[PDB]
Amino acid sequence: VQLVESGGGVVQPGTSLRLSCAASQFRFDGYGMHWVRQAPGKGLEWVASISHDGIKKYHAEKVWGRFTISRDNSKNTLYLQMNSLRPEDTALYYCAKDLREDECEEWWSDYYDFGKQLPCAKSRGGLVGIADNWGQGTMVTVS
Amino acid sequence: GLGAVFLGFLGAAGSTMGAASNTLTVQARQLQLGVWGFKQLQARVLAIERYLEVQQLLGMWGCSGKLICCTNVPWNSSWSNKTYNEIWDNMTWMQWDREIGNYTDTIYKLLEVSQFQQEINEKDNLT
Amino acid sequence: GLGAVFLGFLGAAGSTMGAASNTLTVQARQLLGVWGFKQLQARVLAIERYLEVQQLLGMWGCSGKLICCTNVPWNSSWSNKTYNEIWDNMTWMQWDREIGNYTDTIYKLLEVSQFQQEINEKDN
Amino acid sequence: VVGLGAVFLGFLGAAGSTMGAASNTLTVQARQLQLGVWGFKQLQARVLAIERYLEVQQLLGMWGCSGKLICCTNVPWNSSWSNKTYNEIWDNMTWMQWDREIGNYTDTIYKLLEVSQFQQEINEKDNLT
Amino acid sequence: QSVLTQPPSVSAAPGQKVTISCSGNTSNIGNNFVSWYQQRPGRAPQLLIYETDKRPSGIPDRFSASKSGTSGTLAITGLQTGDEADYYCATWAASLSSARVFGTGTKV
Amino acid sequence: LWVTVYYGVPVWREAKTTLFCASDAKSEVHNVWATHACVPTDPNPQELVLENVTENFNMWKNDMVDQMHEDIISLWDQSLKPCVKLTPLCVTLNCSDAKEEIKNCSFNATTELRDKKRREYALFYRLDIVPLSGESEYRLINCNTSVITQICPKVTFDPIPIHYCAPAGYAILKCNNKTFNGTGPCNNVSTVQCTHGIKPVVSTQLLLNGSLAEEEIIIRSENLTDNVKTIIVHLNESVEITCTRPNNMTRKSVRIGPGQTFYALGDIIGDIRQPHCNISEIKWEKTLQRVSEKLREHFNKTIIFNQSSGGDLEITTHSFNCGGEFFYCNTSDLFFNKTNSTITLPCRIKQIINMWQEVGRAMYAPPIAGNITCKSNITGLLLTRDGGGTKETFRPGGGNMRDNWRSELYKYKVVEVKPLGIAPTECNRT
Amino acid sequence: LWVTVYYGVPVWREAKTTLFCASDAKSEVHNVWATHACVPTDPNPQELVLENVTENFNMWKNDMVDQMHEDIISLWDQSLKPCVKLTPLCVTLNCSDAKVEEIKNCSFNATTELRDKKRREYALFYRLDIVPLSGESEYRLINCNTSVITQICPKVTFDPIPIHYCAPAGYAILKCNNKTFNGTGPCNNVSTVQCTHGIKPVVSTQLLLNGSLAEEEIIIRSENLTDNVKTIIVHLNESVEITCTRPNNMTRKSVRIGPGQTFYALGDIIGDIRQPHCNISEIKWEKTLQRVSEKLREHFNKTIIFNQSSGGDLEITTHSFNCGGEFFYCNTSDLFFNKTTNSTITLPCRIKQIINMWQEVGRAMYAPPIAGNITCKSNITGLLLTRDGGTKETFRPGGGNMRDNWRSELYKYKVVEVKPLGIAPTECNRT
Amino acid sequence: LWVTVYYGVPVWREAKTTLFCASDAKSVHNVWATHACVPTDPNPQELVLENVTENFNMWKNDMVDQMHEDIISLWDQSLKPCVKLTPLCVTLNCSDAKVREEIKNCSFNATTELRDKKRREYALFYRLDIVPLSGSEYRLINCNTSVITQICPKVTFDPIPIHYCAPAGYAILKCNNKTFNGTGPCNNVSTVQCTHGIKPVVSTQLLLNGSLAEEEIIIRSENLTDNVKTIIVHLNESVEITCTRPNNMTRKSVRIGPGQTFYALGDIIGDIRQPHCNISEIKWEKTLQRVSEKLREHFNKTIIFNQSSGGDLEITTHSFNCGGEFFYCNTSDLFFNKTFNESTNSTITLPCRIKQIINMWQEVGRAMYAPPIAGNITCKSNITGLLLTRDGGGTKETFRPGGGNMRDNWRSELYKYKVVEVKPLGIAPTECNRTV
Ligand SMILES: *[C@@H]1O[C@H](CO)[C@@H](O[C@@H]2O[C@H](CO)[C@@H](O)[C@H](O)[C@H]2NC(C)=O)[C@H](O)[C@H]1NC(C)=O
Ligand SMILES: *[C@@H]1O[C@H](CO)[C@@H](O)[C@H](O)[C@H]1NC(C)=O
Ligand SMILES: *[C@@H]1O[C@H](CO)[C@@H](O)[C@H](O)[C@H]1NC(C)=O
Ligand SMILES: *[C@@H]1O[C@H](CO)[C@@H](O)[C@H](O)[C@H]1NC(C)=O
Ligand SMILES: *[C@@H]1O[C@H](CO)[C@@H](O)[C@H](O)[C@H]1NC(C)=O
Ligand SMILES: *[C@@H]1O[C@H](CO)[C@@H](O)[C@H](O)[C@H]1NC(C)=O
Ligand SMILES: *[C@@H]1O[C@H](CO)[C@@H](O)[C@H](O)[C@H]1NC(C)=O
């Protein structure tokens, strides 16, 4: 397994930035992802959370309206738009991966055929808040 | 055979009533659930229902095994006002039943009471 | 045809036995689907009920008479009543409950009497 | 089928006795859904019971014997059907062996009783002009 | 904006016993499971405790943890020199975003 | 002195037999109660009175009510065997809200071929569809516990009188005591060849078209001191009732497969309105008090009327048929709440009926173009006691289906006549 | 002076009853007519001669043909209920031409013995049996949008064997013997029997096949001889021959569709493809339409001209018959019906496999292809005609109904019931 | 001198008619429609025809041709409203069962409650019930040749005795000769209205519950010197047999379409044990030593028993029924593996195999499916009669077990019955005319 992040670098106060997290060695559309941050000398802190398809998005209370998260089934990366950079935002931003896989239970079918593999209909399994794989992360710096 | 006996009665249907009583003598001297499996069953039950119906109707008034039996009902003059020489010598049986065809229910009822009344008077000869 | 004749016998259910022979006089002188198999099962059942009576009337002789008579002595153990008491103060339905358990022994005894009378006559 | 089912088997007994004694030993002998496959076979059986009962009754009614048991028929016994005498038959034969010998002439013997009764009917009833 | 009260640093001598606690509130741990993690100095974090009663196949039986009401406790036996790292507490619930708060860190 | 026989004596004995149909001369529509195979009736029937007779009758241990319920059940199975089944209809119905009880379902179905599909649309009532993920996507009510079939659109369900006539050799007795309930010895027994007209209808709470008592309200039951017995109430002065459907539906023929097709509701002409039944107010409170004075004479306690319990819409609802469209009317708390105007009755229509509450039975009734109006007629009632101990409460119960006909065959009893009689006399063979 | 009753008087009155089958024992074949479960006949049937009697009976008011129509219909439905259907065959086809056209070589997807796998098979279907969705090309079966289609079993046959209709015990079937007795008329040479003669149940539209030549003086039976709807049923007295075959040598491919189902479709056509054709004799037929034109003129007092069939469909317009298990459809339009040495008339015929027989929207059959070379040699005894209107009268063939194929053989029969109880006054009282 | 007729004479004539059911009034909806059958009488009255010798055949009988045609039409009447397993057989991805190894764990794809969607269930099937495709992935055994239907669990296959009774006017004769073989005249024939109890059991090699002979062992056959006709050996002092399976089974209802469902095999409580039968060897060895004594009497040479022929499984096994699960026992090499010349009851154990999808009466077109019976089944049955065939040696006559038809079972209970009709009309001469 290997998780690599992108979008990091030096930024200026008040500007914008979009982080990326390339996923590999596993089924991208079958696991949820989490974004964390840990200030130097402090503890970790959740940033955002997304499902396997991106229909459910959740963030922190302090970044409502400014921080967003989305994924893409054709390019397999996680986006995180960070606006209004603040000096208290410098932290160890990592890319997390959930463990619970959305195992499908009812696929769409076609009587008189029963051979065509149609998309899924009723899947089970959401986010659990457990990160089994942690990338190297990209360090951000604002001043 | 129930079928071969009802066909012999229909022989000589064009002869007069006076000669039909003796013509039958000279004619008898020389002598599983499919659609087809259900109509045969429905026909045998209909054959039995027609044989005893004409047989049980006889048993009500005296006659049970006879053929030329006589009854004790006086012949009216309103049902048929023709002489004996014309009925039994110049008319077939099919034509005769077209004349008295209306006096049928009034006759079968009169034949029954004329025989049931006989049993009451006969069995009262001991009291 | 066979139903209207059986219904006429019931017209004197409450009349006495001695008057039932004459009460019928004043009455006669006064006047492939589910059903294809249900009606078929009724016409067969109607014929079976008719000749069953016309068969018992053949084993005792008088196969065509209404008020018949047989040569069997009336045993004084089946009924301890008199002759004048039955035909004046008794109805036909009430009389059956007092004797209707001696029918299987009186139908067989009546069958032997007519069978014995046939051998004794044709021998002469 | 409940009343006429045990009457045909009744006289089937004493089938080993002679002819002249069959009329005597039998006297002392009696001195003692509804639409499935079973529903259609029972209905098929009740029709065969009535068809086989009145067929015997229809043959008797045409011989002058309405319901009698032993009725004498005014027909002379032909000598060609049986060369044996009268005393030998009733005491040296049986009813089952009798059918194997005379039963082959059952065609002309069932019509001879008819003419001897039908002609006798008009000779008495129709004679009263 | 909740926080998990944890000791900033505790003494860890080879052979003694160290307890790591995690006290929160009713909204974050009173109705949801709790987890645990370890972040060694200069290394990436890794999963240690999931579903509050199950452990991955990569860790020995020395790592153990439990919870009691609104507070959880981590009890580990067999302390060595290489175990001195930063351990965290973690709660997560999809109902409200006030339950997703990491621990402040426990340096052993 | 000697034994003699007697032919034709008035001796009858209780027995069981099969009774066939006997309809009138009015027949081609091919109703479910077929008449093209039923023997015609008799213009002048055979009936006579038995002088000085006393026969003990019984209603709850009768056989005709067990054969009639077993006859019409095989009648529906005969008329539904060559019909088309709605099996390929159990698809993911994407039903929106129609222009609130009727949903606009748009589903997928197969065309004349089997390799192509098209998007159709039809209207269904809320009672026939159940949700999978509401707010959407719906699904039929019984696509998991029973197979569903469609009635042939060429037949109808008119209640036509039929006569159950015993075979030749039997008799069907008939009591004429006008104050005679189910059990008890009758004293005016009259013998009829067979019964009069019997309209086969289906109802749960009330009792539609039938016969009256002509002398007084009769209260029939098997055990009045019980708690689960359906106390049948027979009336003598019938009340009027009318049920309508002001909506103006349209029939649409859609395709579901190669050689199979069924009819569903299309657009609805005119504004949407709700079905309702009417009952005269003065004519009801008068016909209810007369039962309050008769039912009190068997308990000597004050009585009050409650509504039904609830649950499924087959026991707490006045379920009945009307011109081929099944009606479910909520008659719970409009005249049964507590005890020149007109009492209304809001109803609701369902077209997927589980007949007789049997697993494996599901009939889809096709819609009927135009409005309908059934000027019905109430003749009887159905009640049910409660576990009381003081007062008493009675609720309209639905104990059984065969109980609907015991209010019509209460004065009938089939018997087997035996004409052979044995009686001693003084005679011998000359 | 006294009433007396007679048992066995010749008195009869017509009524209705239910007749049963009767056919001599021949052999298992499992024919479509359930004669293996039918009562055998009698070698010498009873045929009395009723003299001095003139019974009049109608032909079109008869009821023996209404029971026969309700018998054959119920017979085919019995032999088709346990059959296998062609429902999984209603798939979009993809056809092309045949070898060195009315024969299409179609290919489609077909599910194998288990639903998870699908293979592409090919078969041969007639052009008259498939309809195009859009002429480009993709085709479909002709009965995949009206009703379900079933395939008859390959073991059962369509061979028309003679069956007899016998009245139950207690009835009597009358039979006339008059020479020039048409449909309705009092017949004087009446005779009674208990079982009908040899009746071969066949089907046809324009002509009659394997009939029974009655007598001389060719009869013109009808109901309203001065109308435009009643179908004239001619009854010939000198039948001519009609022979036709199928000169192809076709195989029988056994394809598989659905789990547990299979049907036999056309495979290869050995040799060159040739057109079927019937060979009604020429000189023997020209004088047949000359004796009829001289017999039909007397009933109209006009000269008559013959046109072709009307046009439109195939089952109701032109010839349609069965031959050895394969249903034919000829035209016979303007080769001998266009008139007013020893050559021969050659009629181009067409063959179809799916038949909407009995004139309903449902119950469509599918006759499997018979491998080999089918050959028949039948007789034509009587035609079916129909007026036009309107000088000269124009006649044309037309099968106005299907029951007329049996009224050509059940026209001289009448079922009656006997009532042998008689009543007559005499001088004999109860002594 | 004059002809006269007689009514009621002892005159019969062999014929054929249609019989009907007759059983006790002890009434479940059994597979045999006994709840719609007429009850019998508590005292069957029969006569004793004295001094008469009647001969009747056993193999040319008609009651066996009517009883076999009745059960065939009776199963179809009880399987018509049954649900068919048409959507069942798909590409099954069967694997080995999680604990000699004759049961597999299969997981397939089936349509859910509504047709538009599908799911993935799991079930347990026997190795004898599935066949492989790539000779991994298995598929049902006989859904490529015919449609398959299951049996509703509301019915039972309990063999209850039925009486085949003749209509009024007919009499079913009955023999009483003790040593009466197949054909021959019975010197002590006695008439009866109809037969005794007949249990409709199905077996192939050893006859199950049935009537025992009175005096000695009877060897019935059509032609003993033939090579194809089966030799029905009737037994006296029957040997008991107990066939069990100490494994548990839990049924489970799975969905295979809208409104259709069938029960499969779920979990299995405890470990797997071989379903086997038990036979007391002391009584069995005492039996085969006697059957090998009378066959020598008719052949004048020594005889040996041998294993079954082989080939398929529906013929060379003891395919009987018990509880509701059709067994297939290896009744060879433990019974028929020895010859005959001149203590602690070491019970013989027969390893049996269970099969669900059975196509009885070798009729391709109908293959029934039996639901699994929860728990364990145990039936202590009787073995009254065997079926043996010859080979054609010569020496020594090698005998092999195995029937030749399915009608052969009922030819051992109907070996002393014959249907005849009475002709009560008689004709005899006398000295009496109709003038008296
Ligand atoms: C031939 O048929 C014609 C009509 O089709 C018959 O002519 C009339 O038939 C009716 C009965 O259908 C009779 O009542 C008339 O008396 C007939 N003659 C007229 C109206 O002039 C004609 O009778 C038939 N031929 C025979 C021999 O019966
Ligand atoms: C009739 O006799 C039977 C004998 O079985 C007896 O049980 C019954 O009580 C008797 N009935 C009367 C009314 O004596
Ligand atoms: C045989 O038995 C019958 C009936 O008992 C008897 O009449 C006959 O005499 C017996 N024959 C001998 C040899 O006794
Ligand atoms: C009886 O008659 C047949 C001819 O019907 C004849 O062949 C036979 O020899 C006769 N005698 C017998 C059977 O003893
Ligand atoms: C009416 O019903 C009561 C109780 O339900 C019962 O006691 C009585 O016998 C019945 N009949 C009459 C005539 O009262
Ligand atoms: C009910 O009353 C209406 C109103 O007159 C009447 O038309 C109808 O016939 C009555 N019902 C019956 C069953 O007679
Ligand atoms: C069909 O033609 C072939 C080719 O000559 C011939 O052998 C065959 O006999 C013909 N078919 C019939 C039925 O004669």
PDB file of C-alpha atoms and ligand atoms in Angstrom, chain F residues 199 208-212 238-241 375-379, ligand 6:
ATOM      1  CA  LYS F 199     -77.997 -13.442  -3.786  1.00  0.00           C
ATOM      2  CA  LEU F 208     -76.301  -5.925   1.842  1.00  0.00           C
ATOM      3  CA  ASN F 209     -79.261  -7.084  -0.295  1.00  0.00           C
ATOM      4  CA  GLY F 210     -81.220  -9.919   1.306  1.00  0.00           C
ATOM      5  CA  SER F 211     -84.475 -10.893   3.023  1.00  0.00           C
ATOM      6  CA  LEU F 212     -86.310  -9.546   6.066  1.00  0.00           C
ATOM      7  CA  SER F 238     -84.559  -2.185   5.590  1.00  0.00           C
ATOM      8  CA  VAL F 239     -82.679   1.102   5.300  1.00  0.00           C
ATOM      9  CA  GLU F 240     -81.412   2.850   2.186  1.00  0.00           C
ATOM     10  CA  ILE F 241     -77.761   3.279   1.237  1.00  0.00           C
ATOM     11  CA  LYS F 375     -78.277   1.959  -4.760  1.00  0.00           C
ATOM     12  CA  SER F 376     -77.685  -0.841  -2.272  1.00  0.00           C
ATOM     13  CA  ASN F 377     -79.978  -2.029   0.530  1.00  0.00           C
ATOM     14  CA  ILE F 378     -79.060  -3.038   4.087  1.00  0.00           C
ATOM     15  CA  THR F 379     -80.929  -6.025   5.520  1.00  0.00           C
TER      16      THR F 379
HETATM   17  C1  LIG I   6     -83.615  -1.930  -1.303  1.00  0.00           C
HETATM   18  O1  LIG I   6     -84.400  -0.743  -1.475  1.00  0.00           O
HETATM   19  C2  LIG I   6     -84.375  -0.223  -2.812  1.00  0.00           C
HETATM   20  C3  LIG I   6     -85.167   1.063  -2.795  1.00  0.00           C
HETATM   21  O2  LIG I   6     -86.506   0.855  -3.221  1.00  0.00           O
HETATM   22  C4  LIG I   6     -84.938  -1.257  -3.783  1.00  0.00           C
HETATM   23  O3  LIG I   6     -84.830  -0.758  -5.111  1.00  0.00           O
HETATM   24  C5  LIG I   6     -84.179  -2.571  -3.657  1.00  0.00           C
HETATM   25  O4  LIG I   6     -84.795  -3.564  -4.469  1.00  0.00           O
HETATM   26  C6  LIG I   6     -84.158  -3.038  -2.205  1.00  0.00           C
HETATM   27  N1  LIG I   6     -83.369  -4.253  -2.070  1.00  0.00           N
HETATM   28  C7  LIG I   6     -83.840  -5.467  -2.372  1.00  0.00           C
HETATM   29  C8  LIG I   6     -82.888  -6.607  -2.175  1.00  0.00           C
HETATM   30  O5  LIG I   6     -84.981  -5.637  -2.787  1.00  0.00           O
END
